[PDB]
Amino acid sequence: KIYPKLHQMDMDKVSRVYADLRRESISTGSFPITVRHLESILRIAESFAKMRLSEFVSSYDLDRAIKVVVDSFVDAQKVSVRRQLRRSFAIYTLG
Amino acid sequence: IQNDFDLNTSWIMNDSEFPKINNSGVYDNVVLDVGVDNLTVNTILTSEFVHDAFSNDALNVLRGMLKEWWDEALKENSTADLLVNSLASWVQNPNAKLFDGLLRYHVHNLTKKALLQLVNEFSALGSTIVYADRNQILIKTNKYSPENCYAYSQYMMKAVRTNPMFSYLDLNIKRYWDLLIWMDKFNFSGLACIEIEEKENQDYTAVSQWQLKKFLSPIYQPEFEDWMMIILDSMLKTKQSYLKLNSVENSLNGFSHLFSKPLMKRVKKLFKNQQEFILDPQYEADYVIPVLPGSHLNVKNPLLELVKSLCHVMLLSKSTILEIRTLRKELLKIFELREFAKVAEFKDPSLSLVVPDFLCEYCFFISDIDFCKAAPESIFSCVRCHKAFNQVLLQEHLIQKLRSDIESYLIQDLRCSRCHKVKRDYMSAHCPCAGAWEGTLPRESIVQKLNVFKQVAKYYGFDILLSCIADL
Amino acid sequence: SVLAAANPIYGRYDDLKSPGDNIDFQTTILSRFDMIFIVKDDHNEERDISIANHVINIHTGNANAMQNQQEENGSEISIEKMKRYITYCRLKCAPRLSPQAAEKLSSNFVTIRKQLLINELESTERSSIPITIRQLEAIIRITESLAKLELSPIAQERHVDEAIRLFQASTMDAASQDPIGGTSLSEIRRFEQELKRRLPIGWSTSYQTLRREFVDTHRFSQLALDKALYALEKHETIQLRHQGQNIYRS
Amino acid sequence: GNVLPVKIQPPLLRPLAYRVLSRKYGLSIKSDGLSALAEFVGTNIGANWRQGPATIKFLEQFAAVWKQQERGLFIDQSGVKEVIQEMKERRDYFKVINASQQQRFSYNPHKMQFIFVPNKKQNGLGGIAGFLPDIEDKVQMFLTRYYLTNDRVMRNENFQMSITPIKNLLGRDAQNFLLLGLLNKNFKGNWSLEDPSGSVEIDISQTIPTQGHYYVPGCMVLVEGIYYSVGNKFHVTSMTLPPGERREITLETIGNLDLLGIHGISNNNFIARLDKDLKIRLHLLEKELTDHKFVILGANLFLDDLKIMTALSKILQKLNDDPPTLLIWQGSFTSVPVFASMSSRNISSSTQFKNNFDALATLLSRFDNLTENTTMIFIPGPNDLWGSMVSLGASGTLPQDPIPSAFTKKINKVCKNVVWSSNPTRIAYLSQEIVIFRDDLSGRFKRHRLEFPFQKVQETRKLVKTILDQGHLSPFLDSLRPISWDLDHTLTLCPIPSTMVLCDTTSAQFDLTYNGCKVINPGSFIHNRRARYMEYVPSSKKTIQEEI
Numbered sequence A: 001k002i003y004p005k006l007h008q009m010d011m012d013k014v015s016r017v018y019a020d021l022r023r024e025s026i027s028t029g030s031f032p033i034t035v036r037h038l039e040s041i042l043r044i045a046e047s048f049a050k051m052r053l054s055e056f057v058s059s060y061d062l063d064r065a066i067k068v069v070v071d072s073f074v075d076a077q078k079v080s081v082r083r084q085l086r087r088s089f090a091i092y093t094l095g
Numbered sequence B: 001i002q003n004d005f006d007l008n009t010s011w012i013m014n015d016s017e018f019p020k021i022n023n024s025g026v027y028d029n030v031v032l033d034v035g036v037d038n039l040t041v042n043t044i045l046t047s048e049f050v051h052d053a054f055s056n057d058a059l060n061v062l063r064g065m066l067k068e069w070w071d072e073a074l075k076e077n078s079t080a081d082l083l084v085n086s087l088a089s090w091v092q093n094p095n096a097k098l099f100d101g102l103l104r105y106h107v108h109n110l111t112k113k114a115l116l117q118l119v120n121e122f123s124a125l126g127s128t129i130v131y132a133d134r135n136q137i138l139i140k141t142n143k144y145s146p147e148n149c150y151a152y153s154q155y156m157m158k159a160v161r162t163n164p165m166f167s168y169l170d171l172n173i174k175r176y177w178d179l180l181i182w183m184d185k186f187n188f189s190g191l192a193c194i195e196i197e198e199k200e201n202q203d204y205t206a207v208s209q210w211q212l213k214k215f216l217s218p219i220y221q222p223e224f225e226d227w228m229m230i231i232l233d234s235m236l237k238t239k240q241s242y243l244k245l246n247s248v249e250n251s252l253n254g255f256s257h258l259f260s261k262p263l264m265k266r267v268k269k270l271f272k273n274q275q276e277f278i279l280d281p282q283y284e285a286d287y288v289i290p291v292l293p294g295s296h297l298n299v300k301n302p303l304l305e306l307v308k309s310l311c312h313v314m315l316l317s318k319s320t321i322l323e324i325r326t327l328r329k330e331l332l333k334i335f336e337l338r339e340f341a342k343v344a345e346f347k348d349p350s351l352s353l354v355v356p357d358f359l360c361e362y363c364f365f366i367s368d369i370d371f372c373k374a375a376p377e378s379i380f381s382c383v384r385c386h387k388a389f390n391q392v393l394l395q396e397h398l399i400q401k402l403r404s405d406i407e408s409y410l411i412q413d414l415r416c417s418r419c420h421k422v423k424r425d426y427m428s429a430h431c432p433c434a435g436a437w438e439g440t441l442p443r444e445s446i447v448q449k450l451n452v453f454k455q456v457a458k459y460y461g462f463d464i465l466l467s468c469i470a471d472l
Numbered sequence C: 001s002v003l004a005a006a007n008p009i010y011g012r013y014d015d016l017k018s019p020g021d022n023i024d025f026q027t028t029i030l031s032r033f034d035m036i037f038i039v040k041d042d043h044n045e046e047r048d049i050s051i052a053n054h055v056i057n058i059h060t061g062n063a064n065a066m067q068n069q070q071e072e073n074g075s076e077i078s079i080e081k082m083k084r085y086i087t088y089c090r091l092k093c094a095p096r097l098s099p100q101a102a103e104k105l106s107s108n109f110v111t112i113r114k115q116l117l118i119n120e121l122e123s124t125e126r127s128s129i130p131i132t133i134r135q136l137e138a139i140i141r142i143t144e145s146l147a148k149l150e151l152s153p154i155a156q157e158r159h160v161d162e163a164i165r166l167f168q169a170s171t172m173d174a175a176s177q178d179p180i181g182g183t184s185l186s187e188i189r190r191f192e193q194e195l196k197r198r199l200p201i202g203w204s205t206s207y208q209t210l211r212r213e214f215v216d217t218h219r220f221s222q223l224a225l226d227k228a229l230y231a232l233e234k235h236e237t238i239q240l241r242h243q244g245q246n247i248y249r250s
Numbered sequence D: 001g002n003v004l005p006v007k008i009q010p011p012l013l014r015p016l017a018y019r020v021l022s023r024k025y026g027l028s029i030k031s032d033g034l035s036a037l038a039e040f041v042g043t044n045i046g047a048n049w050r051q052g053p054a055t056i057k058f059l060e061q062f063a064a065v066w067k068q069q070e071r072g073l074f075i076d077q078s079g080v081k082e083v084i085q086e087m088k089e090r091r092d093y094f095k096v097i098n099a100s101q102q103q104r105f106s107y108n109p110h111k112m113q114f115i116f117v118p119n120k121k122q123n124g125l126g127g128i129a130g131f132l133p134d135i136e137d138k139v140q141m142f143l144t145r146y147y148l149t150n151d152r153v154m155r156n157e158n159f160q161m162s163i164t165p166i167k168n169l170l171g172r173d174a175q176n177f178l179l180l181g182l183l184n185k186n187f188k189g190n191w192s193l194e195d196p197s198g199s200v201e202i203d204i205s206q207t208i209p210t211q212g213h214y215y216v217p218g219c220m221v222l223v224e225g226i227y228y229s230v231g232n233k234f235h236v237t238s239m240t241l242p243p244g245e246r247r248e249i250t251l252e253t254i255g256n257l258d259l260l261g262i263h264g265i266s267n268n269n270f271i272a273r274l275d276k277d278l279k280i281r282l283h284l285l286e287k288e289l290t291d292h293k294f295v296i297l298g299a300n301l302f303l304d305d306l307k308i309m310t311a312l313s314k315i316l317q318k319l320n321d322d323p324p325t326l327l328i329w330q331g332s333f334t335s336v337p338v339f340a341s342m343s344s345r346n347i348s349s350s351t352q353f354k355n356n357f358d359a360l361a362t363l364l365s366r367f368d369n370l371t372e373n374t375t376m377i378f379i380p381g382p383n384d385l386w387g388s389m390v391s392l393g394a395s396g397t398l399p400q401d402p403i404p405s406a407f408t409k410k411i412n413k414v415c416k417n418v419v420w421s422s423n424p425t426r427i428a429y430l431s432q433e434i435v436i437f438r439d440d441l442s443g444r445f446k447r448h449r450l451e452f453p454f455q456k457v458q459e460t461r462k463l464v465k466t467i468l469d470q471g472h473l474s475p476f477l478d479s480l481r482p483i484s485w486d487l488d489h490t491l492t493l494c495p496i497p498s499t500m501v502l503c504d505t506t507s508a509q510f511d512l513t514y515n516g517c518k519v520i521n522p523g524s525f526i527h528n529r530r531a532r533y534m535e536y537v538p539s540s541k542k543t544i545q546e547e548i
């Protein structure tokens, strides 16, 4: 029954996060990142909205989705740069 | 041949810009402020295929002439001293005969190379260059206490002087910095001691030069000047506490905890009062946004820019980023705004209009001058001596800058869209590959430059410049 | 008409690898195709910001309004009207060429064929993307379709220039895209030594002087031009201004 | 009104106006037009409302006056203006114009017709920066020049053999060909010809050029030779500049366009033409032309040295008693270029330049006849305020700005007719078109002459022949003479003016005429302890006078 609706989302925050993940990535490592991951973040936010049986996405769901995505991206790097990227990407998932 | 116009000569004629290095940030270590003198003469004395070359025989002849000049000047000759002092101004001034633009460009390029070599030598030891210029250099010292940099600074001085490349340089120390908040040449604040003394605690005086405060509302500038002093005091206290205890540094981590709650309550009160008294007619005087030359931002709510500047000053810590971001989000939560909104992004409230190499005849002193960012009663007078400058000379130099800009735009080259290859035909529809030509100099840049020229000519009384504008 | 979608071997094109071992299609299959476009991914964060903005807008919450205005301001037409118009144009019009267009096409084909031979004699392997008379027929068909769009009974230079532009794009993007694939390198380091030695930072020299000097020496013109434009491709110490005459060292 | 005006009632005059202006001719009479007719009736109260012929015939005259303006479908407050025109209808007709206000006209090759271009000043805002040309203008400028030259070549009587485009030379060899294009140097350093189709190389080792021309890079040349596909060398056997055309045959291809239109102008809405008044103005010019004399001086008259002022005072003494119509002063007025002053102890260059014109206002106080009767024309030279301030006395942009108004605040008040223009300027007489252009030509064409491997009256012959065959004031590339991207149409000799004032300090004085155009070559104002100035009679006669 429940269908979430997505109206009030931070355009700039998500856009800059996607720009940053386009940065690094193949330019510095090997993991590929494309537009599909943006829709993945959005689908994860919608799922988190579905968790609460709510028809509209709040800010906490977007924060949780972005935290999950950035954590999954960070924990798949070489141990040399994991700490550096962890401290670098700490500004978007501040909470 | 010199009567004919040429592209290379015109390019080497108007390329008088001198670059500089500025590494903004927040520093807790001691910083040394130094000045360099006699750079041009040392550069001259020190150091077929290339078509842009200046005749090397003449260069050697003048090098020997300057060497004998220096030798005679050392042995108590006032005339040789004045001649050496005036040599640089002779080089710059085209009015003097036997003048060649190639020689001036050669000397300028050599001076830039010598300055970068000096920067390389300085960075070889333990140092960090904060600001670089033809006249001033700021060096960060690895040590923490000013009293412990006496022999160390003297050692760098002696080592630099003994270098054969820098045998004729004159170097002097002006100030010692205990705690510095540096973001720009016209925007800094910190605690400084003039000269370190023996057996006695040094005298510490706080300074604050901030053209940013001039763009705030008349009623919030007292709040700015109070809270900035408060945060500087808190920073000094926490650094002293850390030094008492013994990319992260614990000298500053934990300083915003001292004033967070009073700042929150003060911002709540200020927002309430602004909400209540913004629409009143007789209170509208204090909420008037001042206008200054070089201003380009149109915005409405003054308290927003107050808090934006207050947070941007703190953000230069580069080591307590998360704490500052948390405090910024908490402050923005008082407003009905969000963390990453475009309206909550700080920008530069003023533009820049710099005139390179203005000459003070009374000193043979050479320096740039910014007509927009610089404060008054300094555009009209020399930096070292307090001699008033001629005004029609300033207007003529500004008009020369404007006309040189227009000519440079007119004689620019064309660049393709997809590939960045240059146009190599006099008449071709587009690149052999995909894409169409575009100019290397965008139109909006020169439009904005003419706009700021209009603002400058309107703020002060410059009728020659206004006549020059009106003729277009 | 066949519209085919394909992915190169090893996922991303891997331009460091040779073009020959990136495409597994034979010469026979590629010749029948006449518009092949290589869609490479790029990263400059500005196109990325624009794409992110476009996707966040194209979500159903906003586009459902904005796209509507495209039928209200006359900028775009609905799909069914486009279908009706295209079937009507297919049924009715069938353009024809003119002798000036024929001359232009002949000259352009000769030029591209000579360029292909020039690339082949250097690369000393056969081109992975061929240029044949089928391509000339392809450009003719593109011109005819462009004229057919506006129901013109005759095709003129206006459509010919656009067809040639599209063909040049689809040629330089795939066929002539880095034909070298990456005397050997011994002269390259030798040539890199002299320009650092003989030409300091901030000064400049004429291209003719350098070409004369290194044709007089053993480098010759073939090695110098490639080396010069690749030192430019490195783009960290070499800059061209003032047409192809001023060799400025940044 | 009349001597005894009577205040009318508009309703009872309404039918009389409406019938005539809505059934016979005219349309859409406004209320203000009705009021204008009301006051005109007040000026015709004599037996009105009972007088038939005079009122209707004056309305017909109103139609014959207001039909020619725009289209005449509305009458605003201007109704009083057409009434005053009726009263006033019951030397002038000449104009001077600079390159800034010249009408813009593009060219289209596929339609073989000139196209009017809307002026950025008149429709755009222009508040901050409206004079900056756009990027593609320089791309299209050489295209336009090549289009005009190709059209001139194709219209020649001899050429109806056919030329061949460059790009069509790839597949053929060992065959002779004819082609034209821009001549210049490639990036490599060889001689090449450029065409919109493409470019080729040039072989010069066995070229016999047509004598009488200055073969200079940047000039259109007709090239005849044999292609060789062994390399890319086009072995040229002869080279010749394209021939020119006369004014009448040039105009007749476009009827008589109002390019330099003083009687009428064209716009984006429509195109204009006129030839009925041309003969009337020609016959008007044929009389009292000796009375309408205009005199010019030499080049580079310096306003700092005493000798020039003394000679000028003598000249003004001789010229005061018989004031001519136009008095043109050409050349730089200061012997030293003006630029930024690095010394605050001495007199500033700008102040010296300003003072250099104040004394002229004093010297003009004792020649009230010349000031009162003769107009003043001033043309900037090489090192005036705007140019020398950046070019430092060297060559620079051709569309030179006029003398700044802040430095000429006393000439405009002492004299009643003073005009400052660009370096190239246009004057439009009743049946004459004259351009004045001040720069150096002999040295420019002497130093940059092409070398072909193999009594002073001939040099000016070659110069005139080349400048007329090429049909452009600046037959040079962008490297030598930088030109503003849009104003280049002002430098084109497409209308081929009747008389040209070739001011050259490096060439002797001459009075040649060729190809239907007459050229005058004023020299330097002072030379070998002599002063010289020349006057031209509009009857194709010249006089040279000198005063020691």
Ligand SMILES: [Zn+2]
Pocket: B360, B362, B363, B365, B382, B383, B384, B385, B386, B387
């Ligand atoms: Zn001074």
Ligand SMILES: [Zn+2]
Pocket: B416, B417, B418, B419, B420, B421, B431, B432, B433, B434, B435
């Ligand atoms: Zn391109």
